[PDB]
Amino acid sequence: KPQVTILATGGTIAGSGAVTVDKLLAAVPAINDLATIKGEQISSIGSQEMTGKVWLKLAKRVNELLAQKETEAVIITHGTDTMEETAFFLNLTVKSQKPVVLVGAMRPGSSMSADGPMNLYNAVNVAINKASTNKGVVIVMNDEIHAAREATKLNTTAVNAFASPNTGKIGTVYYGKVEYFTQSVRPHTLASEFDISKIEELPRVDILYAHPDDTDVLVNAALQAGAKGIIHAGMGNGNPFPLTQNALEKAAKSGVVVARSSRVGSGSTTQEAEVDDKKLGFVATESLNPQKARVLLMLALTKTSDREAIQKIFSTY
Amino acid sequence: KPQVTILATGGTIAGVTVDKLLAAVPAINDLATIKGEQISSIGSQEMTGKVWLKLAKRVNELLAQKETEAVIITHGTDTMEETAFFLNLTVKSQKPVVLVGAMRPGSSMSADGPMNLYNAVNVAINKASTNKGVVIVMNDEIHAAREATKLNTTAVNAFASPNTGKIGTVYYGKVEYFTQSVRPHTLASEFDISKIEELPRVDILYAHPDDTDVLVNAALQAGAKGIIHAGMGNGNPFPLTQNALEKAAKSGVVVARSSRVGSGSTTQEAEVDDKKLGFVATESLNPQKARVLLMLALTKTSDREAIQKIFSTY
Amino acid sequence: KPQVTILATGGTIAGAVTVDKLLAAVPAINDLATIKGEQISSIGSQEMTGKVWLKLAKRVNELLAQKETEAVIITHGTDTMEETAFFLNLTVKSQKPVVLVGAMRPGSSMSADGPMNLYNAVNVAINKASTNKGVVIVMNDEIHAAREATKLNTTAVNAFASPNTGKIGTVYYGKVEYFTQSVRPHTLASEFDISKIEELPRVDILYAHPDDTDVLVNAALQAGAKGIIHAGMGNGNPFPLTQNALEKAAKSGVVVARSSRVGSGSTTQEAEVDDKKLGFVATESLNPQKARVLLMLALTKTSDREAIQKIFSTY
Ligand SMILES: N[C@@H](CC(=O)O)C(=O)O
Ligand SMILES: N[C@@H](CC(=O)O)C(=O)O
Numbered sequence: 001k002p003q004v005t006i007l008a009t010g011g012t013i014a015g016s017g018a019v020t021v022d023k024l025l026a027a028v029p030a031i032n033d034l035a036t037i038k039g040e041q042i043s044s045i046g047s048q049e050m051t052g053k054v055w056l057k058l059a060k061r062v063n064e065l066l067a068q069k070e071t072e073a074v075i076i077t078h079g080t081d082t083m084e085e086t087a088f089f090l091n092l093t094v095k096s097q098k099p100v101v102l103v104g105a106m107r108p109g110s111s112m113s114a115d116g117p118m119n120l121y122n123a124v125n126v127a128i129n130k131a132s133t134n135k136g137v138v139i140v141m142n143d144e145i146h147a148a149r150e151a152t153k154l155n156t157t158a159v160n161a162f163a164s165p166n167t168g169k170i171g172t173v174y175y176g177k178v179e180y181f182t183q184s185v186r187p188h189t190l191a192s193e194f195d196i197s198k199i200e201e202l203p204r205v206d207i208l209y210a211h212p213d214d215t216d217v218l219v220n221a222a223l224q225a226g227a228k229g230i231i232h233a234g235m236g237n238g239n240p241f242p243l244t245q246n247a248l249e250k251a252a253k254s255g256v257v258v259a260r261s262s263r264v265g266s267g268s269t270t271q272e273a274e275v276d277d278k279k280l281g282f283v284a285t286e287s288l289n290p291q292k293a294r295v296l297l298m299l300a301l302t303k304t305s306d307r308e309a310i311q312k313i314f315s316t317y
Numbered sequence: 318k319p320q321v322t323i324l325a326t327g328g329t330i331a332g333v334t335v336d337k338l339l340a341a342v343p344a345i346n347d348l349a350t351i352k353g354e355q356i357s358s359i360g361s362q363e364m365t366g367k368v369w370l371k372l373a374k375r376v377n378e379l380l381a382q383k384e385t386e387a388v389i390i391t392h393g394t395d396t397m398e399e400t401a402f403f404l405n406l407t408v409k410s411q412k413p414v415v416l417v418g419a420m421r422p423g424s425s426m427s428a429d430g431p432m433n434l435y436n437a438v439n440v441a442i443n444k445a446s447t448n449k450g451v452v453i454v455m456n457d458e459i460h461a462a463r464e465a466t467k468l469n470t471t472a473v474n475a476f477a478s479p480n481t482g483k484i485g486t487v488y489y490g491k492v493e494y495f496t497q498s499v500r501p502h503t504l505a506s507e508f509d510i511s512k513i514e515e516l517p518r519v520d521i522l523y524a525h526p527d528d529t530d531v532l533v534n535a536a537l538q539a540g541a542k543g544i545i546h547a548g549m550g551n552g553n554p555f556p557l558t559q560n561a562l563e564k565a566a567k568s569g570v571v572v573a574r575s576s577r578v579g580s581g582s583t584t585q586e587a588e589v590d591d592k593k594l595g596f597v598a599t600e601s602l603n604p605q606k607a608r609v610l611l612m613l614a615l616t617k618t619s620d621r622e623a624i625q626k627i628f629s630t631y
Numbered sequence: 632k633p634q635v636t637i638l639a640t641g642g643t644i645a646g647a648v649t650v651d652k653l654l655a656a657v658p659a660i661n662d663l664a665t666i667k668g669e670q671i672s673s674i675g676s677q678e679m680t681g682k683v684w685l686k687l688a689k690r691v692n693e694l695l696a697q698k699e700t701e702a703v704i705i706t707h708g709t710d711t712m713e714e715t716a717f718f719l720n721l722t723v724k725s726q727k728p729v730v731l732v733g734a735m736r737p738g739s740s741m742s743a744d745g746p747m748n749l750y751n752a753v754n755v756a757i758n759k760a761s762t763n764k765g766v767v768i769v770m771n772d773e774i775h776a777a778r779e780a781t782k783l784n785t786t787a788v789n790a791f792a793s794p795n796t797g798k799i800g801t802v803y804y805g806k807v808e809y810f811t812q813s814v815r816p817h818t819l820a821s822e823f824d825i826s827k828i829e830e831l832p833r834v835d836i837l838y839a840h841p842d843d844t845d846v847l848v849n850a851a852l853q854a855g856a857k858g859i860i861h862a863g864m865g866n867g868n869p870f871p872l873t874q875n876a877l878e879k880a881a882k883s884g885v886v887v888a889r890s891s892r893v894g895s896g897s898t899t900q901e902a903e904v905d906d907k908k909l910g911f912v913a914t915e916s917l918n919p920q921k922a923r924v925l926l927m928l929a930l931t932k933t934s935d936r937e938a939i940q941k942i943f944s945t946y
């Protein structure tokens with residue numbers, strides 16, 4: 001039987017109207033026939049309380065586990081609110097082709113029709129599947145396998161809240177039967193340039209929410225708080241309000257990296273549209289979303305604040 | 318023929334004065350007696366409350382005219398949803414008000430603006446469009462202003478109504494409705510901006526892991542009367558941010574919880590005790606439309622219970 | 632300059648117009664490639680037949696075997712573009728790009744979608760990253776894997792989707808980016824070879840519903856069906872009277888392959904239908920019309936239930 005470690009971080013999956021990893025397994029006992037499972041509690045928080053500190057601890061623990069000859073995969077039980085950020089971070093910091101699966105539940109374990117038991121059963125099946133190797137970090141939810149680059153929570157409450165709006169799920173898992181149909185062609189995991197092994201604190205990156213009659217006072221406050229980067233969640237194709245644009249221009253001139261994303265939810269925040277990024281000193285984040293653009297910019301800033309080098313990062317990963 | 322006025326405000330649809338915009342689609346003149354009027358000439362990413370008030374008052378004046386059947390507003394796609402939602406609560410008429418734009422400029426291969434404008438005129442004159450509220454007509458679809466959003470950066474099909482769906486269709490000018498909003502709009506709205514020269518300041522914050530208090534603090538220092546929090550998942554804040562929003566709400570700045578996710582309700586009685594923290598739950602909107610509704614709310618009250626009732630009604 | 636052949640088959644993209652006229656309407660493509668046009672057929676795609684599929688595939692294989700030729704674009708009606716693209720995806724013995732493109736509005740229409748679609752197709756066909764992506768449909772600034780693509784809407788310019796995956800890439804004013812690729816074998820890796828085939832095996836499709844019938848199964852058998860796709864209720868479920876007739880069809884050696892009418896998801900093995908006891912094949916993650924194409928190709932080499940199940944579980 002393959003050896004898998006489950007790292008528990010908290011989330012609604014571990015809620016009762018907090019449950020232990022052994023008690024989550026004991027609700028899905030069938031799971032133990034698939035794999036020799038070890039559980040380890042890394043954190044016990046709603047994912048809305050996640051920090052860079054916890055991300056670093058998690059990434060370094062995953063790298064330690066996957067470096068072990070006997071350990072075939074890691075599963076991470078997690079809140080659904082920021083699972084896309086944790087998964088994207090790990091996608092760029094896990095130096096292994098071995099499977100890493102994030103899984104949660106939109107309803108607590110106590111709920112009628114709790115989604116967590118089936119999500120966890122399916123997550124184990126994905127984790128031990130030979131075809132999961134070198135797929136990158138995946139989120140497994142509602143019978144779907146999502147590439148961490150592409151995944152997002154797109155609904156506040158639905159069990160089917162996860163989507164990959166720019167590319168779709170890469171595979172399915174239906175009662176443990178695992179099929180892949182696509183794979184990411186953007187570099188991940190072992191092929192990532194990033195290495196967080198010697199990092200204790202990630203660079204501060206703020207996110208701003210664009211709208212009509214917008215302001216410069218939030219750019220100004222992020223700068224005053226020592227932001228090394230700002231993600232602008234722009235209107236349509238990453239467009240700013242003029243007053244805000246002016247403040248972002250000043251921010252970029254001072255060496256704070258300004259990366260343009262969108263509030264809209266899907267699609268690329270493109271280069272060579274309405275914003276002259278070269279003249280203003282900005283990066284276009286292309287086919288991400290504000291919260292995952294933040295993660296990539298935080299990792300970019302561990303080794304450069306050069307606009308060209310950071311545009312190449314966003315145009316690669 | 319029915320009289321329709323087209324108010325032009327700018328946007329990629331005009332990437333060109335309204336006479337030459339209207340002249341690109343001569344067929345619209347078979348449908349209606351069309352007058353064009355240039356209200357503004359801006360990218361919708363440059364819109365302000367000043368232009369919204371100008372626009373609403375002009376629409377009201379036109380629709381109060383016996384002979385004016387409908388108003389079409391040509392507009393940038395970026396903030397069309399905010400302008401439509403604002404008009405949906407400030408236009409005191411059941412006559413049709415149709416917003417239309419284009420994701421490609423008129424110069425483009427396969428420009429979408431000509432068909433969109435033709436369809437918009439057909440929606441505006443259709444008898445079934447009366448009392449539907451303000452609508453966005455894009456990509457052969459009719460979306461209720463309450464429900465509509467731009468969901469994609471670039472696609473001609475960027476508009477969606479993720480919590481409902483389109484209320485109707487328009488296909489080479491053939492108009493059909495299948496649903497209608499049951500949320501009050503237009504003539505049934507309590508809001509009246511006829512005497513308002515300036516809208517209350519409302520900020521929007523973008524929630525994430527390892528969040529901050531400094532942007533809440535800056536909105537307060539700038540004299541925000543309202544803050545929309547675009548929360549993680551079902552409107553959840555980071556604790557440091559929640560503490561700052563609690564301070565904001567105690568100071569009499571209205572804090573309304575929405576979500577960054579894109580769809581679904583930011584619900585009451587989930588993980589956030591709104592009653593104890595003094596917050597409003599914005600329910601089935603999105604941050605940018607919740608901002609519009611909070612701006613209108615603040616024109617008559619800053620009371621939490623009264624603003625919760627507004628979000629739970631409109 | 633890359634050399635590309637555009638093979639015109641008809642469709643509303645050409646709504647009628649000659650190939651050079653279609654080409655002359657988007658002059659920007661001539662800076663991108665040396666373009667040659669060829670008229671293969673001039674029909675709406677609702678009139679497509681296996682005869683045209685074979686002519687097209689053999690001609691695409693001839694062109695792509697030429698050292699001088701970088702890629703082929705096929706202009707096509709939208710209605711059955713997914714069936715032609717899927718057929719070529721399993722019969723084209725090259726890694727060179729093959730792009731299908733059409734238009735939901737004719738060239739004469741307000742806001743005709745054909746010019747941008749064709750311009751974008753030419754950009755996809757010459758892009759270095761399009762090599763070994765398999766046959767693709769390029770529509771509405773999207774690049775769809777032929778295995779996954781379907782027309783999902785009657786009218787909309789955005790009617791194409793890949794409901795089980797999603798687009799593999801984007802093309803926005805000619806800028807080509809891939810984000811994913813299929814992990815199902817295609818083109819040069821496919822076991823199928825139609826080089827000596829003149830007529831494809833007859834495969835019917837049946838539409839399931841409550842109070843269903845055995846008469847259409849029987850008519851297809853009488854007409855010499857070599858296979859039947861059953862577009863079943865939910866997860867490929869038949870009505871009992873229909874199932875009985877399908878069981879008789881399978882016993883007689885006509886291959887019965889279960890798909891679904893619903894639009895998305897897999898018609899799975901080991902659900903409510905005992906395929907092994909009944910002699911059926913589960914088509915898994917396709918749709919009825921693409922399952923028809925794969926069954927027609929399967930039948931050019933075997934009628935064996937296990938061998939055809941392995942084909943559906945591979946391609
Ligand atoms: N707030 C919860 C929601 C969930 O897990 O569904 C969390 O993200 O931890
Ligand atoms: N930035 C433009 C985009 C468009 O109209 O499509 C606007 O909103 O004015």
Ligand SMILES: N[C@@H](CC(=O)O)C(=O)O
Binds near residue numbers: 642644674707709
């Ligand atoms: N019936 C046409 C429809 C189209 O091309 O859009 C065809 O498929 O040829």
Ligand SMILES: N[C@@H](CC(=O)O)C(=O)O
Binds near residue numbers: 865868903
């Ligand atoms: N085949 C079952 C499927 C279900 O209920 O989920 C039925 O329709 O009765």
